[PDB]
Amino acid sequence: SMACYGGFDLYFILDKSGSVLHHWNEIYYFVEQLAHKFISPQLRMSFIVFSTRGTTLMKLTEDREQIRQGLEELQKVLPGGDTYMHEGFERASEQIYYENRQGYRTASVIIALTDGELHEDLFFYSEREANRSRDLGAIVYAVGVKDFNETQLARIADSKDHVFPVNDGFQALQGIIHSILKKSC
Amino acid sequence: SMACYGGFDLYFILDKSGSVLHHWNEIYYFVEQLAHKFISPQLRMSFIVFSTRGTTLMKLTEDREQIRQGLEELQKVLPGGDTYMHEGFERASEQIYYENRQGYRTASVIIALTDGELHEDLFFYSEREANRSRDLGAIVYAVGVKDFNETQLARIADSKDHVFPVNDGFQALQGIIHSILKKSC
Amino acid sequence: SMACYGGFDLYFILDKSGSVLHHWNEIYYFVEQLAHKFISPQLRMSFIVFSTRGTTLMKLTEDREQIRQGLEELQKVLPGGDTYMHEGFERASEQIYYENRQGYRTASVIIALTDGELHEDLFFYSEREANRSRDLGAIVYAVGVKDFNETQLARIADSKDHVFPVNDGFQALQGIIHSILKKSC
Amino acid sequence: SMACYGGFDLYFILDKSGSVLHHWNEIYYFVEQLAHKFISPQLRMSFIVFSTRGTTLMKLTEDREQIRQGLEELQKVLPGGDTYMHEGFERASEQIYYENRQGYRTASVIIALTDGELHEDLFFYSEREANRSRDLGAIVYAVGVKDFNETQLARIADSKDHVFPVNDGFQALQGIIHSILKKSC
Amino acid sequence: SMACYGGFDLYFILDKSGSVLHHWNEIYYFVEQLAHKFISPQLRMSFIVFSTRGTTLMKLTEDREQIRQGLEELQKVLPGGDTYMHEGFERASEQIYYENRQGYRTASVIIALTDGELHEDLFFYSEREANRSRDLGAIVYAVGVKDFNETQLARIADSKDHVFPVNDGFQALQGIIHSILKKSC
Amino acid sequence: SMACYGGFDLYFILDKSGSVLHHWNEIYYFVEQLAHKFISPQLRMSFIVFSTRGTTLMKLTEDREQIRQGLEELQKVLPGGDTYMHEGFERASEQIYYENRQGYRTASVIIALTDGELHEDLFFYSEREANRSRDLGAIVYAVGVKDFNETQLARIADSKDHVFPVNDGFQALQGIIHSILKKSC
Ligand SMILES: [Mg+2]
Ligand SMILES: [Mg+2]
Ligand SMILES: [Mg+2]
Ligand SMILES: [Mg+2]
Ligand SMILES: [Mg+2]
Ligand SMILES: [Mg+2]
């Protein structure tokens, strides 16, 4: 609807698995640059990392000092481990569920950065948990690095229109985030 | 979305035109029964009347004393005048717009009570304004009295499934309202 | 769309197969009731019969004298033969295609009267041809005679909401036709 | 799709909680009536019960002797315990997932029999698990016992059109199952 | 629908506000080149300009002499004033409404050329009026000048797929126009 | 659905009409490229050619020796004749219908290679038969050669997103085919 958003919650779900070793710097830069472009307290963001497990590195916050510290932490991430992306979505869903209980109309947006190199069962669990996120009200974007398959990530994201490569995705999502911020109450 | 509702705002849009002279008691008691069944401050309601013009008899409120006074004023309504239903929707939309700016996730539900006897241009304006209410985030129900045409009221309401006869309307909408209240945060 | 209809074309597709032998009066009088209720030249109608083959008994017309003669011919129908309903839809679609070439915005409505007792391949062909009618712009209703299967007829009609028992058929369809006629330009 | 079904898998999810103590006969009889109405090996069925926990009483089978034994086990059920309906759906989803891996085009139909008296968190889990069933290809019907709330059950079922009262739900589902069996390869 | 179009009405809604000062040449050239590429009387067009107010510079017409004169007038347009785009859509909708009353099946297409630099309330009114145009049967395209926000223009146009930059948009729209003309009755 | 595919059936519908006389090597190379990249018996393919008539050059098969011989025959194709694409779809639908009767959950994908230069009535027949393919469960992609109109091919394909130019077709469809093979049971 045309109803404004009382909240804007941005959840970064970040692949730090072994396979993205040579792409972590561009994953980090993507996140850092969106953060530095949108410094308004109207936008809250969370940093979630995943490899062998999914962990909330920084819980959802409007506080730019906490965001600064979270980004410093992200810059120091050492890629390694498996690619259990579904746990990244679990970390988002847990937070979205809690936020829902506050009763605000929120643009709950997920940006998942990954190379899409997920083993069969892991992809299945990821699609399941992404659907779970959507059930809680989330809009899911997937930004692919390296040799990601767009159709594969389109099962994680809301649609194929919600899937971008890293460089194109940065420009596209900057516009989307701007639009959502203009649509804030 | 499975996200709970931070608000539940019920807008009664009530036909008080000349054509409903023998049916006002049915309309009033429909409203009175619902108001008396759901006394929780979690439910806010507004009473809008329309004939020659559309007027907000009681602005959206959770206050049961205000609601009591509103019901007492509704009881004394004397049907008469034309059927400018679109103005009834205008009164609802104006309030919905204002409430939107607060940024809460709200079940904004319209219940329009009418015989559906709208002249051609008046029907056109009504559908336009009902669409406008939907754009603001409203769910429109139509409850028909007299010999109402279900297909006609289906263009005002969200769908044919949002159209009920007056004698069956209470039981179905009591259920709907109960369900929404159980989905309150 | 809120745009008015430049035309209203009503296509009766009528089962005259062996299985409805003693139910023909029920079928005919449903048709006659509607025809005599709606005498406006704004409504054009065609009468199509089917059993072993499908045949246009009366081509689409606004002319009430032609409609009178068509009705007289329908009265005298002698049921018998197979149930090749798909040919009945073929007769409607051929006319719909022709009318389409005139370029008017038309409510093209099919009402199919049948017991739905179609053998497997015949049902397949019927669903195919009903879909083809929809592709040409038709809205398909099915009115069930005898102990019909609602879900089966829902494959032919637009949805389960477009299926009615013959006993309740008139009341529902007369309302629908009245609404479409009010939506005429 | 007009494509026939290579399989037809019917999953009964049966409430045996304390709240249905006086209504188990209605629940059992619904299942018994359907099972013995459709004795074709083309229809496979599973009986799942739930109260404090969800348990597969009879795994999906076409074998009528197993079905007989399953029904005799249902005759012995003593209602009691909580209403953890989500676990009933879990038992269904586990079987559907396994069946999916066989690669057949199957009509996977769930019929959940319940009074809908679920506490808030339990209802949340149930809607979540029902959605998960739908993700795996299931069509969910809910058949209501006692004075159930159809809007609430519509959150579990596919839609309000997939919700039926128990005392006139055998007639509705019998027709639906007949139709699905006629759409079998 | 596969039905051919009895008419093809193309509405250019053209931003002549102060913010498009360096881009009017681009906007005019886009219109001029499309008009010159499609001279068939089967295509009718209207030129609407907007800044502080929205005005119909040339009402819908098939007459190429009137179009020639309209283009001459458009060429002399001097950018300046506010950006009340909603009025441009009001000018289109008024014409669409009148044309609807004729009862022809028409491809009513809007092309809005703008930088999308609308202040908050103006954007709200614009989205409201674009929705109204859609309700009347219009398909809305947005062609952006400058570094426009695609997501923002996607609120005006039917979808993000209906949003184009100037060069891609020209090629895309001449293909769309060619296709619609091939679909003429 | 998240349910894996029991089968993956790929139907190439290839334009060999006079209008593509100097472009056959483009069309052939596209097919040869895809065949050679995907040699898994999990993928079955059919080669259909059309000009004046539509003919199945190679019936649906997983046999790579038959595929090898099929490609050899495709290489030798000599363009000429009319563009009766609808017959190409008829050859695909015939096979899809047969395979449906086996009752496996199959990804039935059509890739139509054409310049889209179809005369009015031929385009009508093509849209009709493509719709029929979809009704049987097919997903339709169109890959355009020469100066094709994307909007026109979008009427044959499922959507505009299912239409690709021949120079961008391989990358997109390779990714799609890979994804479907990964989603095999
Ligand atoms: Mg990895
Ligand atoms: Mg009145
Ligand atoms: Mg018969
Ligand atoms: Mg219980
Ligand atoms: Mg401006
Ligand atoms: Mg050709």
Residue numbers in the entry:
A (entry chain B), B (entry chain E), C (entry chain F), D (entry chain D), E (entry chain C), F (entry chain A): 36 to 220
From the paper:
By using a genetic approach, two PA cell surface receptors have been identified: TEM8/ANTXR1 (tumor endothelial marker 8/anthrax toxin receptor 1) and CMG2/ANTXR2 (capillary morphogenesis protein 2/anthrax toxin receptor 2). TEM8 and CMG2 are type I transmembrane proteins with three domains: an N-terminal, extracellular von Willebrand factor type A domain (vWA domain), a single transmembrane spanning domain, and a C-terminal cytosolic domain. CMG2 was reported to have approximately 1000-fold higher affinity for PA (Kd = 170 and 780 pM for the Mg2+- and Ca2+-bound complexes, respectively) than TEM8 (Kd = 1.1 µM and 130 nM for the Mg2+- and Ca2+-bound complexes, respectively), the latter of which is about the average level of integrin-ligand interaction. The MIDAS (metal ion-dependent adhesion site) motif in vWA domains can exist in either of two conformations, much like the integrin I domain: closed (low-affinity ligand binding state) and open (high-affinity ligand binding state).
